Design an enzyme around this catalytic site. Sequence first.
Site, PDB file in Angstrom:
ATOM      1  N   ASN A   1       0.850  -1.197   0.000  1.00 11.46           N
ATOM      2  CA  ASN A   1       0.000   0.000   0.000  1.00 11.46           C
ATOM      3  C   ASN A   1       0.900   1.267   0.000  1.00 11.46           C
ATOM      4  OD1 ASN A   1      -1.571   2.162   1.792  1.00 11.46           O
ATOM      5  ND2 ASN A   1      -3.022   0.990   0.582  1.00 11.46           N
TER       6      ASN A   1
ATOM      7  N   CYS B   1      -4.883   3.940  -5.955  1.00 13.01           N
ATOM      8  CA  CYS B   1      -6.231   3.510  -6.251  1.00 13.01           C
ATOM      9  C   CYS B   1      -6.282   2.029  -6.794  1.00 13.01           C
ATOM     10  CB  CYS B   1      -6.866   4.522  -7.220  1.00 13.01           C
ATOM     11  SG  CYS B   1      -6.985   6.160  -6.450  1.00 13.01           S
TER      12      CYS B   1
ATOM     13  N   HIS C   1     -11.544   1.845  -0.983  1.00  9.49           N
ATOM     14  CA  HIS C   1     -10.645   0.716  -0.881  1.00  9.49           C
ATOM     15  C   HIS C   1     -10.760  -0.174  -2.121  1.00  9.49           C
ATOM     16  CE1 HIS C   1      -9.276  -3.131   1.173  1.00  9.49           C
ATOM     17  NE2 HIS C   1      -8.217  -2.346   1.114  1.00  9.49           N
TER      18      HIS C   1
ATOM     19  N   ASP D   1      -5.420  -7.999  -1.325  1.00 10.68           N
ATOM     20  CA  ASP D   1      -5.690  -6.701  -0.673  1.00 10.68           C
ATOM     21  C   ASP D   1      -4.372  -6.067  -0.301  1.00 10.68           C
ATOM     22  OD1 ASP D   1      -6.557  -4.605   0.816  1.00 10.68           O
ATOM     23  OD2 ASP D   1      -7.795  -5.796   2.172  1.00 10.68           O
TER      24      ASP D   1
END
EC number: 3.4.19.12
Length: 357
Positions: free
Chosen positions: A12, A17, A258, A275
């Site tokens: 991350n 995006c 998210h 994720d």
Amino acid sequence: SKKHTGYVGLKNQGATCYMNSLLQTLFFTNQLRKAVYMMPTEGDDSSKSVPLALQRVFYELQHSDKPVGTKKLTKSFGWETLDSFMQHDVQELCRVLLDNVENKMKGTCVEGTIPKLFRGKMVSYIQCKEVDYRSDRREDYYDIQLSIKGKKNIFESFVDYVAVEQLDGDNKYDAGEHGLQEAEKGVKFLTLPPVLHLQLMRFMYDPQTDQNIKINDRFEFPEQLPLDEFLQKTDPKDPANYILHAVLVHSGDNHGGHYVVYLNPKGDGKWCKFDDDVVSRCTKEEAIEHNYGGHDDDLSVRHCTNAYMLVYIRESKLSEVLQAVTDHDIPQQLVERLQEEKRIEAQKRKERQEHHH
Ligand SMILES: Cn1nc2c(=O)n(CC3(O)CCN(C(=O)C[C@H](c4ccccc4)C(F)(F)F)CC3)cnc2c1-c1ccc(CN)cc1
């Protein structure tokens, strides 16, 4: 930890995006990943080179035990702020990446990989009803944008995509020397590519609010997708039967929401959730039906989690698109150059810490 699934995540970092979701998606397009490794990037500048930077990210996804960084990649294509991502659809990013890599493959043993995997053929037509005139425009496409508003599922969206529109009344067609003419307008699919990128039209202009707003309408998509009825001419040796590979998902109402992607990388129905840095096993129901979007009879919460892009792979091409990738598919030339880059960035760090401390 890659030990749970065999797959590593992406950091991350920044505000990129949908980028990580699309990177995993392309990484698991194994035939693409193989071609990427073949690019002759020896002469390339690592600050500027999108081809080299994608090689680095794919190599690290294949080998790294720890989450994979993307900072040099985003610098190489120049999307270094949130605004860059807000001004483009996910398919535009995909084209930046795929066009860059296809160009670098020109005159190599993998030239043509990008069109081979991703390019289909369509024709857009306007047919005059009262006179003998037709305009035909043949176009390549690399992705399809599917209308969802008022459509239950992918099947109803495809019906609407090839629906014949009537050009009549005040809306007659300018047929040139034939004058204004009643006509009919449509699109036909001539081919469907091995890897089929579908974006769902969830980011719709709203007059009242005056800008695009994400729509959260329930929209269903299947694990298995037959598309023969949407071709002008089918092929009995190779029916257009598609298998769901990836589901790119977004939660929220804006670009600070998210982004995750679900994949079954082998095309065998065994799904994982990606994720960012956490990759986890998930059920097929978590990947598929749970991303249809909330039921409109449920007022419990705002249902702002749903799919916006689907990747399907043609059944007849599945074993080739998802062909196995081994250490032998990475040139030692590239392996050595990536180690060299690792040393050079291991030192750029320490010199930055010297001048700042
Ligand atoms: C109308 N429309 N809606 C399209 C859509 O939805 N997507 C997906 C996506 O690009 C994903 C990336 N986006 C965002 O991250 C913004 C977020 C979002 C919106 C909708 C769904 C998921 C997230 C937001 F808005 F911040 F919440 C923008 C929307 C892609 N082509 C979309 C188009 C479209 C249709 C036709 C053309 C011409 N070929 C171009 C775009």
